[PDB]
Structure formats: structure tokens, C-alpha cells
């Protein structure tokens, strides 16, 4: 799926190179590559900042006011963990493959069995897959991902991530959440309370104020987490606190971290496509880039009718083409390969 | 054994002393052990005297080399409460010590207790002003490394551009004292070589010259480090006062011993 | 180097990570927090394509996965009787990190 | 910042909103000349006591 995104952008660059070759037959290889790379980078920035971020954080960056040469845009250590966990909490156990005509095909497993979706834990670092052999299979994967609803933004992780993440050493499987916690400890990440204080958020003094909705229900994850920390809220780490804060959206800590990181990335970048001082694009070109969405890129590289995809592929709403057959779960999918 | 990482997970040991002094001590102890092994081969009743001579010679040599490489010339030590690190208002109680040698200054910061603020405070940093070495560059590298505040303060006190001129005078004193000590070591080598030769008078005069050069190194260090204007070293609520350290007195006693030995050798030759 | 919103939090204050017993075991914490039923749909109806596009964006932005030199290991002690990594109750299972 | 600058530039700094760790405060090369000349243009020939 990450490979499918990479293939999507590779094909988009090739398509833009072909377009520029048609527009300028006299241009050499270097000029065509540079213009295509410039356009693709601008499109990637626009989609990542103005389309994916508002849909996945429920927060919108402030209107662009110019380039800030004195603003440090370096990625913060907290942003790594925040973004990684806020994305890993939504990883589905399986991924649908969808046809252009709203048909969900069967996925052939390496066992030669036919399942309804591609199992995530059995596709890690896949050199080859029986149902992934041509470009049309990549297009089907992209369409299925566009039509499939992701997991809930909560503290629960699927077993493909929690138990069957690729083990980098001596083990074929590992715990991705435990690895991320050990990474945050390795990177010297601050505590949850100190992280909130540094961002100007309201201090949290009781364990049940971390997520009032979570404590409202019968879920006892807050009490058990407090017991693990010996009821010491000052020792709660940034990653568990951010995981517990999420409810229908990333928690205020994670949302603030990602929002400020992207604001600094956009404002601190001299090569941002909206920065008119770099001379990368004209006003009309900037408007064209702003009008471009990921649906446009998918339509362009898949060579598909625009009506086959919703205008905002990041969110599926009622009435959008090709509803998913059902919300995917572990049931009906191939068992994860033992460690 | 494998299957786990790392194979050797134990803490990595730290050498418990200065490596140059340890090497000098090891070499001279090996020479002494060889001489003690061959001692019964020394025929007659001379061996006792021989033993004394050998020991004396070795000691002298070792002392010179050690005194040339030890940072124990101007020593001082205080016990204070001081700020420890940046982005932290916590203070540490520690012994802060200055050890100015010929080729540089060693700043020691030993916590009392060593384990304070969940950190191990046993710093012993070196800042060298030897010819070809840039003290300002070393201080800048220390600043970039993030050394504790007392260490940075005492290092900046010895920077070339610091208001109090400790850097220039101490560098001059250490350089010429080291030169005189190297001359004394060469004279010691020549005295050892020539004492085996039939002319014992020249060996005695060379030993006297070794003592004279040691005393001259002492005098030059004292005169060059005394001409400095008073530089107040204030840490926390206390003031660091420096004084001639063990290296100075070791040089004094070794030079006096060499001078007396050469004088006695010359007098005994004249009388006999 | 990466930026820091808060000064680095280390056991020794320089590079040694905070861990047990001051912090709970990573595997115990992961089992306590992240264990739950799969199949819970996103409350905002966000798509999987969005999740993996965000993963691609993260790969574009930051990468702190490859180990550094010299090789330092912060091993995750698997609690005895873990259903996934220590099913035999050996009590010495260690996930290398 | 709040007394000399408003009186000598006729401009007031915006209300303080907090510390910015990611903002570079280093003195610019242009600021040296700008401040030096905007002050030197007002130096009197003499000073009263």
C-alpha cells in the first residue's frame, strides 16, 4: 500500500514528463525532468498540506502569508511519535482491491486461497504477490484503499501492527507500539504533562481528564494505564497520553504537534510553491496547483473516469461511488504468519 | 554465546588514572624489576650501593618525566553549590578543582555525592595551550559539547581573550618549564651513560647540571606565574585559590637531590 | 538533527533512556493500551488511502528507523507468558531493539 | 523595547504573545547600518549640562 502510493507518484512524474515533452518537443531530458519534478513537488505539497491534513486532523493550516527565513522548520522529535501513532491507530487488518466498476475482487493468498481482502501482516516487505502482478492490480489497490474506511482513531491497534509488525532483528515479528514506545524513550521524548505544558495546552491533573469520553464508557484502559504508572500522572509518556487522548480525532497534544510542525514546514520552506519569491511558479500555475487534489492524480495516472472516485479520496461519505462491502476485521482473513 | 544483543552488555571500564603517568610508572617499574632480578648477578658487596644508585637514577628519571607531564603545578580546590547545566535551575554540591600544568589545565568537577540530580558528576576535562594547539578552538568545542557550567567557567577563565591574563603567562611558564625539564632529562640520560665510563667526574657534573636545570625550571615557573595580575575565581559563594601543587615540590626535592648528589660526587673526587 | 519542544528526558540526562522500573514495561503498556477488537470504523469515515498517503508523507518528512553507530541496544523485555512472544512461559524472551 | 523604540521609530512592537523557540533572533547585517545611521542623523553638535 505504501508501495502503491510510491508507484502512484512515480507514474504521476512520468505522466507530467510526457505532458511537458508534448508541450515542448525541443526540451532535453534534464529540462523535462526538472519541470516535471517541480510540478510534482508542488502537487505533493498542496495535497499533503491542504487536503490530507485538514481531513485527517480536522484542523486547517492558517492562510499562507509568505516565506519565513528566520523560522526553524526542522522536524521535532515529538512529531515523529505523534504522527506515527496517529497514523498507526487507523491501520486496517486488511485492504480491499476495487475495480473501476465498483467491483471488489477476491484476493489470492500465497496459500492459493481466495480472500475478500489483502491481509496486512502477510504482505510486509512482499517481494511478489499472486494478486499483485500488473499495473492494473496497483490501480485496484488504490481504488480499494480509496473506498475502504480506515480503523477508528482510538487507542486500539490491529494485531497486524500490535503483534505482527516486521521484526528488524532476530525475529520475523515484533510489537510496533512497544517499538515506538522504546523509540520515544530512546529519543528522550518528554512526559505527557511536560509536552502539554510546552505547547501551552491546559494542564491535566487527573487521569480521567485525559479523555473524558473514554472514562465515560466502560473502557477501563485509563485505570489500568494509571495502575501501570503507579497513579503518577507526571510520569505518563507522550505516546501513551496521545494514544489515550484520541476520540474521533487525534488528541489535542498530537493535533497541536502535527499542526505546528506542518505550519513551520510550510512557512520555513523557501521552495514552497506558494512562495512567489522563489520564481518556481506564476500566479496562474499556483492556482492550478492549488486546484489539484489526490483524486486528480489518481484519475490522471490510472486513466480512469473521474466519477469512479469521490472528490476527496481521503474521506468516504454516503453517496460516494463504490461503498465498501463491509468494515474489515480479522474474521475471514488469512491468519498472520507466526513469528 | 549469542542470540542476544549486545554479546557483552556490561558497562565499559574507565582507566583509573592518567595514562601518561601510568605508562611512565609501568616502564620504570619494569626496569626496576629487571634490575632486582639481575641483582644477585651483581658480584661482591657492591650490590647494595649499586641497588641504591639504580633506584635513585630510575626515580630521578621517572620524576622528571612525570613532573613534565603531570598537571599538578598550580592546584586549587573548593567545595561549592553551583549551577550544573543549561535549561535547568537545579544546583549541585560539588568539589571544583583546578590543576594547571605545563601544557594545559585540567578542570575537575566531582559531585558530593557523585550521584546528584540522577547524573554522575566526576568530570576531569583538559584544555591544552601547547604550541600548535588552539586554546580558543578547544574552548569552543567544549561549549558545543555542553560541558557543565563550572567547567566552562574555569575554561573561559584561561581563554586567550579573557580579561585576566592567566593564559599568556601560564602558557609561557609551562612552555619554558617543559623545555628546561626536557633539558634536565637529557642531562640525566647523559649522566647515566657517562657514569659507566671511567670518567666519573663528568657524570657527577652532568647530574649536578640535571639538578640545576630542574631548579631553573622551578624558578622560571614561579617567576612567570607570579607576575600575573590577580584573577578572582569565584564559584557559587566561594573563591578558588591556587598554590604550588605536588609537581612543584616533587621537582624541588628531585632537583635538590640531584644537586646534592653531584656536589657530593665532586667533593669526594676532590678529596679522593 | 531533529528539533525538541521540551529538553531531552534521559535517565542520566545525556543519552541513557528512561526505562524500567521508573517506566512501565513497553510490552505491558502496549498490551494494556492497544488491546481491543478490530473492525471499528473511523468516526470521521477516513479512508485507508488517506492513512497510507500520510505514511508516505511521513517517509518523505522524517526517518529515524535505521540504527546508529556504535550499535546500542535498548531491548524490550517480554513479560513471561505473553500470548504472542512468550507462549511457553519461558520468562527470558527479549525483543531486540 | 516599549519606551525608546516607540518614541524614536514612531512604531510600536505587537503585543507580546509568548516565546518563540524556532525564531532566529540574530542581528541582521542590514540592522547594523540602519540603526547606526538613523541614530547618527540626530547627533547634536553640542550637549547641554
Amino acid at each position: 500500500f505504501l508501495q502503491a502510493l510510491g508507484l502512484l507518484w512515480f507514474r504521476y512524474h512520468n505522466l507530467w514528463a510526457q505532458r511537458l515533452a508534448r508541450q515542448h518537443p525541443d526540451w532535453e531530458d534534464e529540462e523535462l525532468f526538472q519541470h516535471a519534478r517541480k510540478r510534482v513537488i508542488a502537487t505533493y505539497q498542496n495535497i499533503a498540506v491542504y487536503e490530507w491534513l485538514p481531513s485527517f486532523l480536522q484542523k486547517t493550516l492558517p492562510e499562507y502569508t509568505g516565506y519565513r527565513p528566520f523560522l526553524d522548520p526542522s522536524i521535532s522529535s515529538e512529531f515523529v511519535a505523534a504522527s506515527e501513532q496517529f497514523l498507526s491507530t487507523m491501520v486496517p487488518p486488511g485492504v480491499y482491491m476495487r475495480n473501476a466498476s465498483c467491483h471488489f475482487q477476491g484476493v489470492i493468498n500465497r496459500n492459493s486461497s481466495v480472500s475478500r481482502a489483502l491481509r496486512v501482516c502477510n504482505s510486509y516487505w512482499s517481494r511478489e504477490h499472486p494478486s499483485l502482478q500488473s499495473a492494473e492490480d496497483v490501480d485496484a489497490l488504490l481504488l480499494g484503499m480509496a473506498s475502504q474506511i480506515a480503523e477508528r482513531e482510538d487507542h486500539v491497534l490491529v494485531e497486524d501492527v500490535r503483534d505482527f509488525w516486521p521484526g528488524p532483528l532476530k525475529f520475523s515479528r515484533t510489537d510496533h507500539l512497544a517499538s515506538c514506545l522504546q523509540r520515544g524513550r530512546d529519543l528522550g521524548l518528554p512526559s505527557y504533562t511536560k509536552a502539554r505544558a510546552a505547547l501551552g495546552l491546559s494542564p491535566i491533573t487527573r487521569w480521567q481528564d485525559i479523555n473524558p469520553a473514554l472514562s465515560r464508557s466502560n473502557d477501563t484502559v485509563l485505570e489500568a494505564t494509571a495502575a501501570l504508572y503507579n497513579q503518577d500522572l507526571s510520569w505518563l509518556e507522550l505516546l501513551p497520553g496521545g494514544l489515550l487522548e484520541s476520540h474521533r480525532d487525534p488528541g489535542p497534544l498530537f493535533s497541536t504537534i502535527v499542526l505546528e510542525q506542518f505550519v513551520r514546514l510550510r512557512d520555513g520552506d523557501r521552495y514552497w510553491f506558494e512562495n512567489t519569491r522563489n520564481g518556481l511558479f506564476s500566479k496562474k500555475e499556483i492556482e492550478e496547483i492549488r486546484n489539484t487534489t489526490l483524486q486528480d492524480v489518481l484519475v490522471a495516472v490510472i486513466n480512469i473516469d473521474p466519477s469512479a472516485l469521490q472528490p476527496n479520496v481521503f474521506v468516504w461519505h454516503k453517496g460516494d461511488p463504490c461503498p465498501q462491502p463491509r468494515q474489515l476485521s480479522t474474521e475471514g482473513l488469512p491468519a498472520c504468519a507466526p513469528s | 554465546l549469542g542470540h542476544t544483543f549486545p554479546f557483552y552488555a556490561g558497562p565499559k571500564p574507565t582507566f583509573p588514572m592518567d595514562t601518561t603517568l601510568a605508562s611512565i610508572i609501568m616502564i620504570f617499574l619494569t626496569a626496576l624489576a629487571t634490575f632486582i632480578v639481575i641483582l644477585p648477578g651483581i658480584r661482591g658487596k657492591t650490590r647494595l650501593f649499586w641497588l641504591l644508585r639504580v633506584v635513585t637514577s630510575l626515580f630521578i628519571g621517572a620524576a622528571i618525566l612525570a613532573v613534565n607531564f603531570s598537571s599538578e603545578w598550580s592546584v586549587g580546590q573548593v567545595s561549592t553549590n553551583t549551577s550544573y547545566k543549561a535549561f535547568s535551575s537545579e544546583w549541585i554540591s560539588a568539589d571544583i578543582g583546578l590543576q594547571v600544568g605545563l601544557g594545559g589545565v585540567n578542570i575537575t568537577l566531582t559531585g558530593t555525592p557523585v550521584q546528584q540530580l540522577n547524573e554522575t558528576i566526576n568530570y576531569n576535562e583538559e584544555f591544552t595551550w601547547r604550541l600548535g594547539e588552539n586554546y580558543a578552538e578547544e574552548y569552543a568545542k567544549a561549549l558545543e559539547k555542553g560541558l557543565p557550567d563550572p567547567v566552562l567557567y574555569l575554561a573561559e577563565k584561561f581563554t586567550p581573550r579573557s580579561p585576566c591574563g592567566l593564559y599568556r603567562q601560564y602558557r609561557l611558564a609551562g612552555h619554558y618549564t617543559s623545555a628546561m625539564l626536557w633539558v634536565a632529562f637529557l642531562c640525566w640520560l647523559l649522566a647515566n651513560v657517562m657514569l659507566s665510563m671511567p670518567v666519573l667526574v663528568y657524570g657527577g657534573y652532568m647530574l649536578l647540571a640535571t639538578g640545576i636545570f630542574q631548579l631553573l625550571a622551578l624558578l622560571f615557573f614561579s617567576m612567570a606565574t607570579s607576575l600575573t595580575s590577580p584573577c578572582p575565581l569565584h564559584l557559587g559563594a566561594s573563591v578558588l585559590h591556587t598554590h604550588h601543587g605536588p609537581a612543584f615540590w616533587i621537582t624541588l626535592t628531585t632537583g635538590l637531590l640531584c644537586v646534592l648528589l653531584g656536589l657530593a660526587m665532586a667533593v669526594a673526587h676532590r678529596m679522593q | 538533527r531533529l528539533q525538541r519542544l521540551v529538553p531531552a528526558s534521559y535517565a542520566d540526562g545525556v543519552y541513557q533512556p528512561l526505562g524500567e522500573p521508573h517506566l512501565p514495561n513497553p510490552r505491558d503498556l502496549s498490551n494494556t493500551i492497544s488491546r481491543g477488537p478490530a473492525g471499528l470504523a473511523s468516526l470521521r469515515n477516513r479512508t485507508v488511502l488517506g492513512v497510507f498517503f500520510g505514511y508516505h508523507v511521513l517517509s518523505d518528512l522524517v526517518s529515524v528507523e535505521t540504527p546508529g553507530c556504535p550499535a546500542e541496544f535498548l531491548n524490550i523485555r517480554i513479560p513471561p507468558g505473553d500470548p504472542m512472544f512468550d507462549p511457553d512461559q519461558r520468562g527470558d524472551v527479549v525483543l531486540p531493539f | 523595547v516599549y519606551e525608546w523604540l516607540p518614541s524614536f521609530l514612531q512604531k510600536t512592537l505587537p503585543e507580546y504573545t509568548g516565546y518563540r523557540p524556532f525564531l532566529d533572533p540574530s542581528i541582521s547585517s542590514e540592522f547594523v547600518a540602519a540603526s547606526e545611521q538613523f541614530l547618527s542623523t540626530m547627533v547634536p553638535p553640542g550637549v547641554y549640562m
Binding site: - | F87, S88, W91, E144 | - | -
Partner: peptide, 28 residues
């Protein structure tokens, strides 16, 4: 208690910024 309850500002301007220690420092 210690009367100096805050982190004393350095005279050389070092370590004023958390990640850019040379910002505003002497010689920068």
C-alpha cells in the same frame, strides 16, 4: 532554600535557545 531559584542567564549568550546554542552568542 536557594535564593537563586531560576536558571541564571549566561553572559556569553550561549544556550539561550534550546536547539540553537550559538544563537545570539558572542562571535556568532
Amino acid at each position: 532554600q536557594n535564593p537563586i531559584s531560576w536558571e541564571v542567564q549566561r553572559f556569553d549568550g550561549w544556550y539561550n535557545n534550546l536547539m540553537e546554542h550559538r544563537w545570539g552568542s558572542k562571535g556568532s
